[PDB]
Amino acid sequence: TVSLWETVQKWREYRRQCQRSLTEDPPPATDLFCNRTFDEYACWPDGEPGSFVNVSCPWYLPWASSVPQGHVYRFCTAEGLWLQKDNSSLPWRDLSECEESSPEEQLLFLYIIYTVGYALSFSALVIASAILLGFRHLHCTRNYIHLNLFASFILRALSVFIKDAALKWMYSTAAQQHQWDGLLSYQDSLSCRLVFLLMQYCVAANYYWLLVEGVYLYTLLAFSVFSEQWIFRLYVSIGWGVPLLFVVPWGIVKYLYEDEGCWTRNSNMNYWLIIRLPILFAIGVNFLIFVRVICIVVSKLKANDIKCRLAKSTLTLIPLLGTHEVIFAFVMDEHARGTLRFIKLFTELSFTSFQGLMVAILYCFVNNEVQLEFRKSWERWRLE
Amino acid sequence: QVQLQESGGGLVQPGGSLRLSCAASGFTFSNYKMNWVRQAPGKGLEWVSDISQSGASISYTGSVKGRFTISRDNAKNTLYLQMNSLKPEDTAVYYCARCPAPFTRDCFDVTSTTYAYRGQGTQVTV
Amino acid sequence: ELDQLRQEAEQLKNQIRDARKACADATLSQITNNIDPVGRIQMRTRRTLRGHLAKIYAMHWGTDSRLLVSASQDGKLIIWDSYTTNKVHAIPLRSSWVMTCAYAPSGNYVACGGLDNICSIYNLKTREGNVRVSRELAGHTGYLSCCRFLDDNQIVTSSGDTTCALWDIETGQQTTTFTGHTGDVMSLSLAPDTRLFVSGACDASAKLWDVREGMCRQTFTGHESDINAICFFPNGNAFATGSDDATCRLFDLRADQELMTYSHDNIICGITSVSFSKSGRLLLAGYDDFNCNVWDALKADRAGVLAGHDNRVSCLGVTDDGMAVATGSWDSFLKIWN
Amino acid sequence: HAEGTFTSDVSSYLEGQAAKEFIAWLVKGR
Amino acid sequence: ASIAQARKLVEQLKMEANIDRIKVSKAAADLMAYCEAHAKEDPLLTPVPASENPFR
Amino acid sequence: DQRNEEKAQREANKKIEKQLQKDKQVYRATHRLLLLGAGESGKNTIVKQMRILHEKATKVQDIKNNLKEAIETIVAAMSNLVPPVELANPENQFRVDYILSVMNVPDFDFPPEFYEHAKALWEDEGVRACYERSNEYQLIDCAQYFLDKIDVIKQADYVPSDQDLLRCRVLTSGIFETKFQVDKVNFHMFDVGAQRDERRKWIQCFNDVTAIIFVVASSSYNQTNRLQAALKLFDSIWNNKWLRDTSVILFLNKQDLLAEKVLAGKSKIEDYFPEFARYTTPEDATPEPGEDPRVTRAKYFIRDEFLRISTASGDGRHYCYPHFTCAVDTENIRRVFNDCRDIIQRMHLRQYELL
């Protein structure tokens, strides 16, 4: 659709055309005529006395295509005046033939929920990262993968806070005025393109650290030996490096071919796919890994409340691997419209915002090996 | 000093009865699992019965079930074996054997050849 | 007949117990009833020695009070510099099931052994610079539980075959065998003049042995279960024993009996290791409940706790200058305490 | 992903609301 | 045999019975006198200043 | 200087810590196993077959030697007794004659005719009586033990048990190691030899092995009850506080031998275990093809004796894996591999709080 900057530019061009045009236009040289005038909304040609001067609906209007023919009106009275309206120093002008004919209420309901969730996830994960890094008995390869997943969730929350601030600065009265007058704005700056590019990276790195947790749990349960320093340095390389390998390329495409809006708008869906297709491979492999691990858990429960233990194992594996995204993942942005957009965006935003809180509870706070370190440390605090 | 002294073993007819007693001293008797162990002539040591610290958990070897009764008196520091319906296969030296460590569930080595926490034994001849 | 030899051993046991009762004029608690207590001993972990893969069974301080050797069942002897935490030597073992280690007083050798029934002597001062086996002492028919050098050429071992043995290192032969225990000998401790040693075994008894004459001079009973640990008092006239009965006991040589029992009703786990401080006022004891208790040796009161291990404290050692306590544990770490 | 989808949806909606404002300031006499 | 084992235990009990035992109050006084005469040289009993503690 | 020797100590420490990191990868890659069994469990034979696929069985000729030497000296000493013992059979039958001839034969070959020659001598009551005076003359201590075992040493498949190596003095090593690999996974198996029967101290060394392999002779019931002693030892291993996290692989090794007795009437199980008379075969029991119901009922009863111990105090921290086996089975190495895979997988699922 249309931006402030297209409409401002267009207007500036109309303003240029009327500015010249008024000098070019020739006087009717009759009595009681009205002067030609550009009211900042219209170019009004000089007017005949006692007549409706009927000017075409303007072309800069963002709603112009829907109104191919239309005429704004101003009355040139027979005594040499534009007709003043009732108790108005401004002349009478009728505009209803040139107007346009709530979606924000559900965007506000969405924005409130994920910011409460991301805040509670950021709060629980700075505590959960402090507990795992605090006790040295908890230091192992599993908790090292956990701490990097903790960091990938905190960065996503911080980027969501920064993106929301940026949207409110890009769409401020001050910014709007800056665009209307044509002075440089936030929307035209590499500091604005990097805020949303960092959002891409922190989202994609979080999905690939949910991927590392799947692959590392799959490696342990596949029972064959691996090198604990080369595979772990590969896991840190997979979790942080692979996202740079496809976020950096999607930034080149937006800069060369789609550099409008600070990269906040997906206009060509193929460029969109560059970020999303790479992220759906990581969700899909995490879903298959989720199947094999629960298939292992079922096989162990047969040998040794069976449905209740299996359900508890499933619901705590669900935030570790991000398998809640498998539901509405193939309902693509291109095809998702109406109430289905709401519910795809509702379930994805809300559960992802609360997913960092769940992983802090289930893998730090209720963890039995963590709770034994708090009780042995209080046992060593009863010797003081 | 740990000392276990068994008494009550003598000549008995087949189908007869005999009560064995193990007088314990030198340790806190109620802290330990206690065992009866026997040695038939020509055979090795064979576990007969045990009893837990309070006297609740009681087990027997299969050849004596329904016939032998084990009990302890923690106040008098004594272990009992009430042997009813005695067969000639019950002819053995019967040893009272203490579990090696207190407050444990596992009870290692009580049938070993040179186990220290075991009395010198009383001869039961059927 | 053995029936009369049973009763002859009982009446000599009567005579020894009455000869011990007649010398018991006043207990150690009554003698030390008016001495000032030591207060609360508050030691803290100064060093944590990391690098062992599996559970540590034994350690021994060097006589320089700086170097120490530790033995872990990953198959490694590591010699640490306790000041800088640097590993000085890492010695791979032929058998991984090591249960004891010993640092020689000259600093030139370490010994170790375990389920292989062999005390392996390692030369630390070779001319190329590596650490190689100088001798393997074979002849025990049970696991090696404790070893201590007398000098560079002599070492005393204790074993699961119920015996102790003095070895000539340069010949590999047993000079003397020490028999009389009826259970696995778990620990030994040399006297400060190294003319005697005490051994604690799984028959709930401790025996004092003459090194050169090869006989058992005294037998000490009073423990209820297996003695896992033993250590002389610093003047060599007494020794302490740690047992599975959750008590430590102090025995005097010249009084031929037990002087003191170190216990608490809230302590129900066995003692794995015992050592005295330099003056002998403190008796440190490692426990199965992952802690080490500091005991007032004269007043039998608990003076402190070394807490911080996450598994069974297997061994404990005080430096010869008394500056530090090392504790080894099944969590694979050694801790140095002041 | 849903972050990008929500950000694009917010920025495309708020792009059009500011254009309506611009036209309204123009109608007020700017 | 069992007789040859039990004969040696009789012989050991005779050599352990013929020893001169001092009084326990005498033995306790010698241990009390050692811990007082060496209390100044025990760094775990009285903590040294944190300059000559090499684990500082 | 002081810092020049300190950098030389930091460089020797870095050369150690690199080597310790390479040793750490080897240690975490290898599964350690403690192989444990009653003495005549068939274990040692299990160690022999597992080795030929990839020191204890080597000493079978030293046990060959003692039994023959014991037979020689008694028949020889029979003369020297003041009343030379009359053999119950008046004639030697050549069994005595052959034994005389065998005297001082270098590298004897112990043919089947030599055994039956010795076999029939030893059952002769005249020889039986010459053994009470054996105390009077010089004889090896393991004489009667191996003589009553003529039947077992017969078979060419004979691998001596631990009790056999105990009666003789052949064992010198405290712990025997057998390294092998299944599916490129290294395994380190440790068997205990030349340790006393008092296990309560040295069993603590094996608290962090992957599994204890506890082999049992299921044919043992009817040593009065070799199987009850196997059940008390399993009970002590299962309930020891240091072995409380160590899983136990369980092999019932004499399936074929167990079988011959149950079909024979050579068993009478309900004498040593009176709860067998009211025991029924479980519904989840899947017998081998062509197997008698008398065999399967006795087979799963001995399994349920060991499972009655392990279902108490298990608590999801360590597990019992029972296997019905024979000592020379080729599947056995694979059964250890599958249980060790199940142990490691169950350990990782506890660390993720999924099991």
Question: What is the Cα–Cα distance from C133 to C118, expressed in whole angstroms?
Answer: 12
Question: What is the Cα–Cα distance from F142 to A228, expressed in whole angstroms?
Answer: 53
Angle at F19 between CA F13 and CA F22, to 5 degrees: 145
Sheet containing strand C313-318, strands side by side: C45-49, C334-337, C325-329, C313-318
Cβ-based neighbours of B53, under 8 Å, separated by 6 or more: B30, B31, B32, B33, B103
At position F354, the amino acid (one-letter code) is: L
Question: What is the Cα–Cα distance from A361 to F341, expressed in whole angstroms?
Answer: 30
Q: What is the per-residue DSSP string for C259-322? A: EEEE--TT--S-EEEEEE-TTSSEEEEEETTS-EEEEETTT--EEEEE---SS-EEEEEE-TTS
How many structural domains is chain D composed of?
A: 1
What single DSSP character describes residue F274? Answer: G
Residues F320 and F247: beta-carbon distance below 8 Å: yes
Residue A59 in tokens: 């072309």
Question: What is the Cα–Cα distance from B104 to A213, expressed in whole angstroms?
Answer: 41
Question: What is the Cα–Cα distance from B23 to A242, expressed in whole angstroms?
Answer: 77
Q: What's phi and psi for A84, nearest 5 deg?
A: -80, 145
- Residues A302-317 as b or e (16 or more Cβ within 10 Å = b): eeeeeeeebeebeebb
Residue C315 in tokens: 């061994």
Residues A333 and A269: beta-carbon distance below 8 Å: yes
Q: What's phi and psi for A231, nearest 5 deg?
A: -75, -30
What single DSSP character describes residue F246? Answer: -
Residues B14 and B67: beta-carbon distance below 8 Å: no
What single DSSP character describes residue F219? Answer: G
Range of the domain at B126: 1-126
Nearest by CB to C6, from B28, B100, B120: name it: B120
Residues C128 and C114: beta-carbon distance below 8 Å: no
* CA atoms within 13 Å, Cβ hemisphere of C201: 30
Identify which of C56, C140, C108 has the alpha carbon closest to the alpha carbon of residue C311.
Answer: C56
> Cα F32 to the chain's mean position, in Å?
18
Which helix (H) or strand (E) element contains residue C323? none
**Polymer length of chain D:** 30
Question: What is the Cα–Cα distance from C162 to C202, expressed in whole angstroms?
Answer: 9
Question: What is the Cα–Cα distance from A44 to C145, expressed in whole angstroms?
Answer: 111
Angle at F87 between CA F86 and CA F88, to 5 degrees: 110
Question: What is the Cα–Cα distance from F252 to F288, expressed in whole angstroms?
Answer: 14
Residue F277 in tokens: 């008379």
Contacts of E2 in chain C (CB under 8 A): 2
Residues F261 and F226: beta-carbon distance below 8 Å: no
By the 10 Å C-beta count (0-12 exposed, 13-18 middle, 19+ buried), C322 is classed as buried
Cβ-based neighbours of A342, under 8 Å, separated by 6 or more: A106, A110
**Cβ–Cβ pairs < 8 A, chains A and F:** 51
Question: What is the Cα–Cα distance from A207 to A153, expressed in whole angstroms?
Answer: 9
Cβ-based neighbours of E56, under 8 Å, separated by 6 or more: C46, E50
Which helix (H) or strand (E) element contains residue F301? helix F293-311
Q: What Å distances lie between residue F226 and A216, B43, B48, F193, F217, CA to CA?
A: 47, 11, 13, 19, 8
C238 and E31 within 8 Å at the Cβ level: the answer is yes
Q: Which of F69, F162, F164, F191 is catalytic?
A: F191
Count CB-CB contacts under 10 A for residue A287: 16
Residues F130 and F74: beta-carbon distance below 8 Å: yes
Residue A54 in tokens: 């009927």
Write out chain C in H/E/C secondary structure: CHHHHHHHHHHHHHHHHHHHHHCCCCCHHHHCCCCCCCCCCCCCEEEEECCCCCCEEEEEECCCCCEEEEEECCCEEEEEECCCCCEEEEEECCCCCEEEEEECCCCCEEEEEECCCCEEEEECCCCCCCCEEEEEECCCCCCEEEEEECCCCEEEEEECCCCEEEEECCCCCEEEEECCCCCCEEEEEECCCCCEEEEEECCCEEEEEECCCCCEEEEEECCCCCEEEEEECCCCCEEEEEECCCCEEEEECCCCEEEEEECCCCCCCCEEEEEECCCCCEEEEEECCCCEEEEECCCCCEEEEECCCCCCEEEEEECCCCCCEEEEECCCCEEEEC
A297 and F28 within 8 Å at the Cβ level: the answer is no
Q: Please give the class, per CATH, of domain F60-163.
A: mainly alpha
- Residues B73-111 as b or e (16 or more Cβ within 10 Å = b): eeeebbbbbebeebeeebbbbbbbbbbbbbbbbbbbbbb
Q: What's phi and psi for C66, nearest 5 deg?
A: -115, -55
Q: What's phi and psi for C112, nearest 5 deg?
A: -160, 160
How many structural domains is chain B composed of?
A: 1
Q: What are the residues facing C80 on neighbouring strands?
A: C68, C87
Chain D nearest-CA residue for A345: D2
Q: Which residue, chain included where needed, has tokens 């404002």? A: D21
F225 and B107 within 8 Å at the Cβ level: the answer is no
Q: Which residue, chain included where needed, has tokens 């006790």? A: A135
Torsion, Cα F243 F248 F251 F252, to 10 degrees, reads: 60
At position A276, the amino acid (one-letter code) is: R
By the 10 Å C-beta count (0-12 exposed, 13-18 middle, 19+ buried), F132 is classed as exposed
Write out A184-238 in H/E/C secondary structure: CCCCCCHHHHHHHHHHHHHHHHHHHHHHHHHHHHHHHHCCCCCCCCHHHHHHHHH
* CA atoms within 13 Å, Cβ hemisphere of A136: 7
Range of the domain at E17: 1-56
Question: What is the Cα–Cα distance from A30 to A50, expressed in whole angstroms?
Answer: 13
C86 and F17 within 8 Å at the Cβ level: the answer is no
Identify which of C249, C287, C327, C257 has the alpha carbon closest to the alpha carbon of residue C59.
Answer: C327
Residues F158 and F59: beta-carbon distance below 8 Å: no
Question: What is the Cα–Cα distance from C110 to C123, expressed in whole angstroms?
Answer: 7
Q: What Å distances lie between residue A126 and A123, A363, A364, E2, CA to CA?
A: 6, 13, 11, 72
Count CB-CB contacts under 10 A for residue B56: 7
Residue F72 in tokens: 């020689």
Question: What is the Cα–Cα distance from C83 to C86, expressed in whole angstroms?
Answer: 8
Torsion, Cα A239 A245 A247 A251, to 10 degrees, reads: 160
Q: Is the dihedral of CA C46, C52, C56, C59 positive or negative?
A: negative
Q: What's phi and psi for A131, nearest 5 deg?
A: -75, -40
Strands C248-252 vs C238-243: parallel, antiparallel or unpaired: antiparallel
Strands F175-182 vs C325-329: parallel, antiparallel or unpaired: unpaired
Residue F41 in tokens: 């469990």
Cβ-based neighbours of A384, under 8 Å, separated by 6 or more: none
Nearest by CB to B63, from F199, F236, F272: name it: F272
Residues F332 and F54: beta-carbon distance below 8 Å: no
Contacts of A107 in chain D (CB under 8 A): 6, 9-10, 13
Question: What is the Cα–Cα distance from F265 to F259, expressed in whole angstroms?
Answer: 10
What single DSSP character describes residue B62? Answer: G
**Polymer length of chain B:** 126
Contacts of B121 in chain C (CB under 8 A): none
Angle at F340 between CA F336 and CA F343, to 5 degrees: 140
Question: What is the Cα–Cα distance from A327 to A341, expressed in whole angstroms?
Answer: 13
Residues C269 and C289: beta-carbon distance below 8 Å: yes
Question: What is the Cα–Cα distance from B121 to B97, expressed in whole angstroms?
Answer: 9
C259 and E34 within 8 Å at the Cβ level: the answer is no
Counts for chain F of helices (H) and strands (E), in that order: 13, 6
Q: What is the per-residue DSSP string for A324-384? A: GGGSSTTS-TTT--THHHHHHHHHHHHHHHTHHHHHHIIIIIS-HHHHHHHHHHHHTTTT-
Question: What is the Cα–Cα distance from C335 to C314, expressed in whole angstroms?
Answer: 12
**Touching pair E, A by Cβ (3+ pairs < 8 Å):** no
What single DSSP character describes residue F225? Answer: B
What single DSSP character describes residue F218? Answer: G
Question: What is the Cα–Cα distance from F349 to A296, expressed in whole angstroms?
Answer: 9
Give the CA diameter of chain C: 66
Strands C196-201 vs C205-210: parallel, antiparallel or unpaired: antiparallel
Question: What is the Cα–Cα distance from C184 to C194, expressed in whole angstroms?
Answer: 23
Torsion, Cα C209 C210 C212 C214, to 10 degrees, reads: -50
Q: Would you call F347 helix, strand, or coil by DSSP?
A: helix
Q: Which residue, chain included where needed, has tokens 């209820």? A: C224
Sheet containing strand C56-61, strands side by side: C56-61, C67-72, C76-81, C87-92
Q: Would you call C216 helix, strand, or coil by DSSP?
A: strand
Q: Would you call B111 helix, strand, or coil by DSSP?
A: coil
Angle at B95 between CA B91 and CA B97, to 5 degrees: 150
State the resolution, in angstroms: 2.1
Q: What Å distances lie between residue C152 and B69, C77, C94, C168, C177, CA to CA?
A: 59, 19, 22, 10, 19
Which helix (H) or strand (E) element contains residue A301? helix A269-303
Q: What's phi and psi for F113, nearest 5 deg?
A: -70, -25
Question: What is the Cα–Cα distance from F94 to D17, expressed in whole angstroms?
Answer: 120
Residue C2 in tokens: 């053995």
Q: After which residues is chain F broken (C to N over 2.5 A)?
A: 54, 222
Residues B40 and B60: beta-carbon distance below 8 Å: no
Residue C66 in tokens: 């700086």
Count CB-CB contacts under 10 A for residue A248: 12
* F163 is an active site residue: no
Sheet containing strand C164-168, strands side by side: C144-149, C154-159, C164-168, C174-178
Nearest by CB to B102, from C182, C183, C225: name it: C225
Chain C nearest-CA residue for E14: C12
Q: Would you call C54 helix, strand, or coil by DSSP?
A: coil
**Cβ–Cβ pairs < 8 A, chains B and C:** 41
Q: Which of F10, F128, F169, F317 is catalytic?
A: F169
How many structural domains is chain C composed of?
A: 1
A383 and C307 within 8 Å at the Cβ level: the answer is yes
Which helix (H) or strand (E) element contains residue C228? strand C227-232
Q: Which residue, chain included where needed, has tokens 């802690």? A: C291
- Residues C289-304 as b or e (16 or more Cβ within 10 Å = b): ebbbbbbbbbbbebbb
Residues C252 and C299: beta-carbon distance below 8 Å: no
Nearest by CB to B116, from C13, C202, C270: name it: C202
Count CB-CB contacts under 10 A for residue F179: 11
Question: What is the Cα–Cα distance from F19 to F13, expressed in whole angstroms?
Answer: 10
